[PDB]
Write an enzyme that holds these catalytic residues in place. Structure first.
Site, short mmCIF file in Angstrom:
data_model
loop_
_atom_site.label_atom_id
_atom_site.label_comp_id
_atom_site.label_asym_id
_atom_site.label_seq_id
_atom_site.Cartn_x
_atom_site.Cartn_y
_atom_site.Cartn_z
N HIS A 176 0.82 -1.21 0.00
CA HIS A 176 0.00 0.00 0.00
C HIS A 176 0.86 1.26 0.00
CE1 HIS A 176 -3.66 2.25 1.92
NE2 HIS A 176 -3.60 2.42 0.61
N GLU B 180 2.67 1.48 -3.59
CA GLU B 180 1.82 2.00 -4.65
C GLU B 180 1.39 3.43 -4.37
OE1 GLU B 180 -1.76 2.42 -5.05
OE2 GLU B 180 -2.21 2.44 -2.90
N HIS B 181 1.45 3.86 -3.11
CA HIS B 181 1.40 5.28 -2.80
C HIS B 181 2.65 6.03 -3.29
CE1 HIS B 181 -1.76 5.00 0.66
NE2 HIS B 181 -2.29 4.89 -0.54
N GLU C 200 -3.95 7.11 6.65
CA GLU C 200 -4.69 5.93 6.20
C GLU C 200 -4.97 4.99 7.36
OE1 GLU C 200 -6.04 5.23 3.20
OE2 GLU C 200 -5.37 7.20 2.51
N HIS D 262 -30.08 -14.29 -3.67
CA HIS D 262 -31.45 -14.01 -4.07
C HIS D 262 -32.43 -14.64 -3.08
CE1 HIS D 262 -35.26 -14.89 -6.15
NE2 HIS D 262 -35.07 -13.72 -6.73
N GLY E 110 -32.12 -12.86 1.05
CA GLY E 110 -32.64 -11.54 1.32
C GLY E 110 -33.99 -11.27 0.68
N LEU F 189 -32.22 -8.04 7.56
CA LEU F 189 -31.23 -9.07 7.31
C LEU F 189 -30.51 -8.73 6.02
CD1 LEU F 189 -32.50 -12.46 5.79
CD2 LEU F 189 -33.72 -10.32 5.52
N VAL F 190 -29.36 -9.36 5.84
CA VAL F 190 -28.68 -9.38 4.56
C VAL F 190 -27.96 -10.72 4.48
CG1 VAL F 190 -26.61 -8.12 5.36
CG2 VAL F 190 -27.23 -8.11 2.92
#
Lengths: 949, 939
Positions: free
Chosen positions: B62, B65-66, B143, B290, B293, B313-314
């Protein structure tokens, strides 16, 4: 012919009017009324010469001659001079003629009786018979017969007179038109005026007069005034015309007729020619027959007819006829099987007669009716000096001077021989039948010659007849039980410390509103009660209005059988729909107000419906709906005008259409929802107390919460309705075509302003000043028509000026002469002097300020104010004190820039009603066509409402 | 690195043809050419994540690539690229994940070659000297610092941390203060050595995926950047992947107790499942997404809400690394959801066993298949930045033909996979994580990176096997379908009735039908609006309450059938009017007849459940006596909206009348309304007239079919008028809020009816005092926060309103408002032409605007038909008349009605006090003595 005999007259001991009678030697029965406390004096004169006493060639000759007796004397040969002296002192005379009498009456303001009576005595000297009076009054007799051409009671009357023997003089024609008065005599070369002077001189002066004078001086001074004043009439001894038998001499008896009326009605008519019983006034079998036939009690005939669902309401009894004989009628409504099974109806009638032939006459009914008329007769309150005296003068021919007030109004004896004798007279041998139905088209050939009804004989075969005599039995029919609503409360209640002269709000809730006053003047055991039941749901929709009216209709249909005895005893009631709600008026004695009111509130609180009775109510009121294409176009204009000049109003077509689906369960769900939530406003007046008023009122509302759970209404659901604003210069109109009447009507409306102190006396005085010249120049002089009216309209808290006129004219042509009348008034104001003005406002002042002479009147006035929520019970001081403070130029300002056509404040709207087939007017502003009255009212303001006093 | 593979590319509303190709240095190139973009963009994806991090130094990739941002050899200056971004609207950003490092930016208009050459010299020459290092380490420290309150990274890092601590899934992704410069320097490890090592051997190697949203052409930037990017050198960097899920029977069948910082309460359920990335043909885990949920007939959440324990819910297929995948279910918690957790999991296993019983399904498959086919067909747009980086994100995993039907299309049916993950949906596989504030004294095991604390608390065995043992079929059932016509979604061409405003194609005493076909947008859409006019709606508090609750439970009734149609792309709305009932139908041209027929058949024949009634009754009762508790300016707005209508039932009597609503009284109330009614109707969009008449015929035929509906009378299609003030009066009284100490007030001005002059008088004076109000009242005087001004369209009457809540004496507050109005009077009269003209152009563009969808113009047209104005050409006329005005013109508007000496002053205020002119004693007796305004003529 000075003669005089009088003394004490029995006078129903509440009255203070001192009485005497006398009879002159020229056949003039003079009655002397002396009440030195009276406001209005009057006098009246009846001559027992009627229209059966006409010459056989010219009918209504005495009628037109007493028309002509008015105009022209020898001391004052001027034409209108009598009527002009009644215009000088506010008098309003009229006279009338019957088959046996010709009666005259007049009035006078207070004390000017020497003047008017001096103008009144010399009628006998010189009638003139000039161009105008004769040839114009015959036109008014023609119009008089013409407005009675389509009047069905006189139609069926004259057909009763005419379908007997045409040879008997009872069958003569009572009132003729211009065709009979001056068209047939001169084509036969008969001099009309020779006959006139003949009758006038040789027939008037003889006898048969009756006289009554309400003077306020004394008996004796008015006695040697008038007996001195009346000796010019000399007894010529004309004999009394009497007929010893009826014309229905076996040619027309036991006969049927099926008659086509003018209005769409259905009625059954059965007639019995009967000898006179006027000699029996101490026993009076006619009240016994009418009381026993028309009784609505257990086992009665009407109770059975309600139970068989044939007759809505009825009337029967002894009807007056000739001098020697009289008639006996039975008049009932008809339903479906009333149309188809008439034979059985008459069988039911025979059954009830069989019940009358079983138990015969009754004595307890005699004693009971004696007590009722005795006590109720001795408690007369007061009387109008006009109309009452003409009535007593009407019956003064038949009684000695002490019996002129207790005519049949005291009954000593009981004559079962008479009642059984007329029971023997009431037989199937003695029957005339007349059926009334509009539906008899193509069916009725024999047409009436004058009026134009059409009928047929349809002779009854002998089978039905032979079955009618022999088969007469009794089923359900029972004698009517004794009354229980007979009063004992005759105790005048002493006035309390609370001595208010107007009803105070003695109870204030969110539920009710209670106004009450105990009497101070009349001192009677009586009371008047008025109640309105506010509701939103009464006029929401045509369907709501229909179910409200049919509900209350069958409600009244239900309560009849209980109410009949109380209403026959002097305890009246009323049920009525409003756009606001149900309207309850209760009038009667002090005895049994809780009892009757309690059973009424309990009955309409939890109420049930019959099926086929309601089917008849549906059909009948459905027929009453589409009958509103047949009215007088001035009524049509007044209906539509106050239709337009409120906030909401349903038309009669849309009210007519909404009964297509109304079934009993929809109603029976609707009813407690309707009754669920409502308000109550109440006025209580008469000889009761404040605490009893509290009791009664609390009682009622408690009863209501017990039955139907009424809860009070919030002050944000007690609404009123406004009146439509006009665009402040507009002159708007529309037209409606009548179908029946070939006549156009008109009504024009002028919004002045709300009832403020200025506007009230402005509009009332201006109304007065446009009242009498309108009658003087438009009906009289320009000869527009017969229906001519002008004057005020204060409604919805808004004043107004109106003109109600019905003629046969084009309506813009009619408008043109309306505007010519407006210009005529415009100049006729500005030319009026001070003194005419001062007499005119003095006339206004004494015309307005008066206490009433009946407790029922002033209570209805106060109630009519309370429903308008005004409460200004002291309009008298405010208005009268303001009225002196007016000028001529105020009216000029009132007319020119507000009421005239050249006005920036024109709140002006006319109404045209078109007939069935259709001297200077300025350039008026353009009218508007109106297609949708609603889209007219769409964008238009609405008024404020009134601050209550 | 000029390598090339291309052919015809399958893509249907969009026509801009794109094409993918592979470069010899391992770069997936996608060509985007859109000559209509304002800002062009480009993106590159690197398949190097935080799984390639060194085990001794965490979060290196990270930061590296910064570090490639700052410092080239062409431009080694500090903000120079940044100056090329600020001069040309650029805004770059990049991130690092477990397997990806992705780059995305924008640019002003056309600056391709510049950004290209810069983008080559990013990867050709990064410098990493000292200042890039020592400054970028502060950005990396930010960050790490931003994830203190960032819950996504916190819960995800807690997912990283509660597995095997030896497995490279337990590495960190960013690198903090501790791992980037506290951990290497004490170990003596050179960071820059590993930075150049990582950049050279792992960034530069392979697996690039470039995508460039350009506006130039299809070949010129193509043969520019093909040659230009050869700086990438193939080194065959290995893919850091896991041949097994990292949660391997250490923490399985285990709970977690999490204490958050924000007061949230959640329950997390986790299933690790093997790789189905190859299985994009059936995609069973998303197919499970499908099926989890779904909130429909026989669903799990239907009973769970019906038991009142779980808010939401999920569930679905959660990605992991390439080798493994996850399957999670995350719900919300109530108070008593804490106490019945065992029963919650019990119902979950009941639903699992129901899915095991009835097995896989085909209708669901074809349904999802067709719905994602249509949603793929009718895609809206794309973000100019980020879209490129995203599809480049999936460009790594998919061939050039699979990059667009990414998840929006399914090839095959695989029930064996569904049974496989059903073997994975077992009580042996569950991972549990509870988030609750109440876990005080309860959380011992401290997080490694953040330092928050959690605890396992495994469940004892009585409950565990009871989860196993109880596996039964209960209530829960399959959903229903609305797949009537998925073939016809055609555009309808405009015919001879080319009107820009709705035409009345049918008017009776029973209905009113207005129609407009689309001209502008030409979409497979239709919008339908219906007003059902009836007298019985506002008769009293009681019938109004029963109508409200009637349509309320009708909405509760319709839902149960309506959800499967809502899944097909047809939305609706019911909300009654003060006049009658109002019906909305919005959506496709597809199957609304079939729908609406059943809607009418249901709302015509309607039933009540008793306890449903009780809950709606209590709930609206609560909502009513709750209304004594809100802000006093809303009190002023609603009570003035009472005081200035024709009839109004207050909430006090609406509040009391709910004592009388019984189910049989409502059952009587229902056919009474439905016996006789009127319809007002707009059908608007890309539809026809004749079929609209046939549908309208169906509507009235159904109305006669159920309750024998016959029309309403034409003198009772009324509106309500508004009260006329007494022409000079300014009267006031006060109201009392009960809960809040704030004072409310509202200031009112009646100008006139909506004429063409008055609309622009009103708008112009309102906005001309709007911007100096910003200049002097909120900024300068600091009066309050609820400060509002503007129009008042009510009963066809215009008005001007001022909405102020503050804690003041109300007459004091009036005094400074009127001082502002005198300020505005002089501030107009001292205005030059320039302020005036800029303002009327501001107002011009404020009023004038083209629509953006059929629903927008529908909202405007129907929003005017409900005011019965019909002035469909206010657009030109009104605005053209506003341009013909001066400043003294609105002064003349401001003298006779609005000034203090005004002879037509119609001003009335409402004070709403806290709990601690003329008076108005009774509002009915107030409206007793005052005049009324007329109504408006409908055009």
């Amino acid at each position: 012919a000075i003669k005089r005999i009088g003394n004490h007259i029995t006078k129903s001991p509440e009255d203070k009017r001192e009485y005497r009678g006398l009879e002159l030697a020229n056949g003039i029965k003079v009655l002397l009324i002396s009440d030195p406390t009276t406001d209005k004096s009057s006098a009246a004169l009846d001559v027992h010469i009627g229209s059966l006493s006409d010459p056989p060639n010219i009918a209504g000759l005495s009628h037109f001659l007493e028309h002509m007796l008015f105009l022209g004397t020898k001391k004052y040969p001027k034409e209108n001079e009598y009527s002009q002296f009644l215009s000088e002192h506010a008098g309003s005379s009229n006279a009338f003629t019957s088959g046996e009498h010709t009666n005259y009456y007049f009035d006078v303001s207070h004390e000017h009786l020497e003047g008017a009576l001096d103008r009144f005595a010399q009628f006998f000297l010189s009638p003139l018979f000039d161009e105008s009076a004769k040839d114009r009054e015959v036109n008014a007799v023609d119009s008089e017969h013409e407005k009675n051409v389509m009047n069905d009671a006189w139609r069926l009357f004259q057909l009763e007179k005419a379908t007997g023997n045409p040879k008997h003089p009872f069958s003569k024609f009572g009132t003729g038109n211009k065709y009979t008065l001056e068209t047939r005599p001169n084509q036969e070369g008969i001099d009309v005026r020779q006959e006139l002077l003949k009758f006038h001189s040789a027939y008037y002066s003889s006898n048969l007069m009756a006289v009554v004078v309400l003077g306020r001086e004394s008996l004796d001074d008015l006695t040697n005034l008038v007996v001195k004043l009346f000796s010019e009439v000399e007894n010529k001894n004309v004999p009394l015309p009497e007929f010893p038998e009826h014309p229905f001499q076996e040619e027309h008896l036991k006969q049927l007729y099926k008659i086509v009326p003018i209005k769409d009605i259905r009625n059954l008519y059965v007639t019995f020619p009967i000898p006179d019983l006027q000699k029996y006034y101490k026993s009076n079998p006619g009240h016994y027959l009418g009381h026993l036939i028309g009784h609505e009690g257990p086992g009665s005939l009407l109770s059975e007819l309600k139970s068989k669902g044939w007759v809505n309401t009825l009337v029967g009894g002894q009807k007056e006829g000739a001098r020697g004989f009289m008639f006996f009628i039975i008049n009932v409504d008809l339903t479906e099987e009333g149309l188809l099974h008439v034979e059985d109806i008459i069988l039911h009638m025979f059954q009830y007669i069989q019940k009358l032939r079983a138990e015969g006459p009754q004595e307890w009914v005699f004693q009971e009716l004696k007590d009722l008329n005795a006590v109720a007769f001795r408690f007369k309150d007061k009387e109008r000096p006009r109309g009452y005296t003409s009535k007593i003068a009407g019956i003064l021919h038949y009684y000695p001077l002490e019996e002129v007030l207790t005519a049949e109004y005291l009954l000593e004896e009981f004559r079962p021989d008479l009642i059984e004798m007329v029971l023997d007279k009431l037989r199937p041998e003695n029957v005339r039948v007349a059926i009334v139905s509009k539906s008899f088209e193509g069916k009725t050939d024999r047409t009436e010659e004058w009026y134009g009804t059409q009928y047929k004989q349809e002779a009854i075969p002998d089978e039905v007849i032979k079955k009618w005599q022999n088969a007469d039995l009794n089923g359900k029919f029972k004698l009517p039980t004794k009354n229980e609503f007979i009063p004992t409360n005759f105790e005048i209640l002493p006035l309390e410390k609370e001595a208010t002269p107007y009803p105070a709000l003695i109870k204030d809730t969110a539920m009710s509103k209670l106004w009450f006053k105990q009497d101070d003047k009349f001192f009677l055991p009586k009371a008047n009660l008025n109640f309105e039941f506010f509701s939103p749901f009464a006029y929401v929709d045509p369907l709501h209005s229909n179910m409200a009216y049919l509900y209350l209709e069958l409600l009244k249909d239900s309560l009849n059988e209980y109410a009949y005895a109380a209403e026959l005893a002097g305890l009246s009631y009323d049920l009525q729909n409003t756009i606001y709600g149900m309207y309850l008026s209760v009038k009667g004695y002090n005895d049994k107000q809780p009892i009757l009111l309690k059973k009424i509130i309990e009955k309409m609180a939890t109420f049930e419906i019959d099926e086929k009775r309601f089917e008849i109510i549906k059909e009948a009121y459905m027929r009453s709906l589409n009958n509103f294409r047949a009215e007088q176009p001035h009524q049509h204009a007044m209906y539509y005008l106050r239709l337009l000049m409120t906030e909401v109003a349903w038309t009669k077509d849309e009210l007519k259409e909404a009964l297509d689906d109304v079934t009993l369960p929809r109603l029976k769900a609707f009813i407690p929802q309707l009754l669920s939530r409502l308000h109550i406003e109440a006025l209580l007046h008469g000889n009761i107390t404040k605490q009893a008023a509290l009791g009664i009122m609390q009682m009622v509302e408690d009863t209501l919460i017990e039955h139907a759970h009424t809860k009070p209404l919030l002050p944000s659901q007690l609404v009123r309705y406004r009146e439509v604003q006009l665009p402040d210069r507009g002159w708007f109109v529309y037209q409606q075509r009548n179908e029946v009447h070939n006549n156009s009507g008109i009504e024009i409306y002028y919004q002045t302003d709300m009832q403020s102190t200025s506007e009230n006396m402005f509009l009332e005085l201006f109304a007065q000043i446009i009242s009498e010249p309108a009658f003087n120049t438009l009906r009289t002089k320009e000869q527009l028509g017969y229906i001519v009216f002008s004057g005020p309209r204060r409604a919805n808290g808004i004043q107004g000026l109106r003109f109600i006129i019905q003629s046969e004219k084009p309506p813009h042509y009619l408008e043109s002469r309306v505007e010519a009348f407006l210009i005529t008034m415009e100049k006729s104001i500005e030319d009026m002097t001070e003194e005419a003005f001062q007499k005119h406002i003095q006339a206004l002042a004494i015309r307005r300020l008066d206490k009433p002479k009946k407790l029922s009147a002033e209570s209805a006035k106060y109630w009519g104010e309370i429903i308008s929520q005004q409460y200004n019970f002291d309009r008298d001081n405010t208005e009268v004190a303001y009225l002196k403070t007016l000028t001529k130029e105020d009216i000029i300002k009132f007319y020119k820039e507000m009421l005239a056509v050249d006005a920036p404040r024109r709140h002006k709207v006319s109404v045209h009603v078109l007939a069935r087939e259709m001297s200077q007017a300025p350039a008026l502003p353009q009218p508007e066509v109106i297609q949708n009255m609603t889209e007219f009212k769409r964008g238009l303001p609405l008024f404020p409402l009134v601050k209550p006093h």
